[PDB]
Amino acid sequence: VEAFCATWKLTNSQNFDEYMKALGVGFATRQVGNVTKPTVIISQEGDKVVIRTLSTFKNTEISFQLGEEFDETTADDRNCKSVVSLDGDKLVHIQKWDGKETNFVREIKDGKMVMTLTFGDVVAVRHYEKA
Ligand SMILES: CCCCCCCC/C=C\CCCCCCCC(=O)O
Predict the structure, then answer these.
(1) 60 lines ligand 1 (CB under 6 A)
(2) Most CB contacts within 10 A, which of 58, 69, 88, 115?
(3) 75 lines ligand 1 (CB under 6 A)
């Protein structure tokens, strides 16, 4: 977990639009969500680990205890029952909302954080540079 903790900036995204569509994200948010390069800052608070995200649209904060379920109102408004754990190396973040399910597996590949969003059989991939 000590390797995820840093100020990250997005550098390259891929297939996110297709993923956003899959999630059923509204047109408006898709337009901003497609151009916006956000900053995901991951840090701690002892039993808590936080994930702040900053963009020229929305900034969203989640604080949780690993493996513990919690409620999170996603940026695109879905209210999910999320759980994020460490399946070893990878930081998995599961989001469940009215029957549908989705997951985010963040990794550190050659010192670059790579997130790989997934829903149904439509995967999306993101890249982050430690700034
Ligand atoms: C924080 C809002 C701006 C960044 C997200 C833009 C896309 C908006 C709606 C779709 C959400 C999919 C689940 C959240 C992914 C966040 C990715 C990130 O932190 O960069």
Answers:
(1) yes
(2) 115
(3) yes
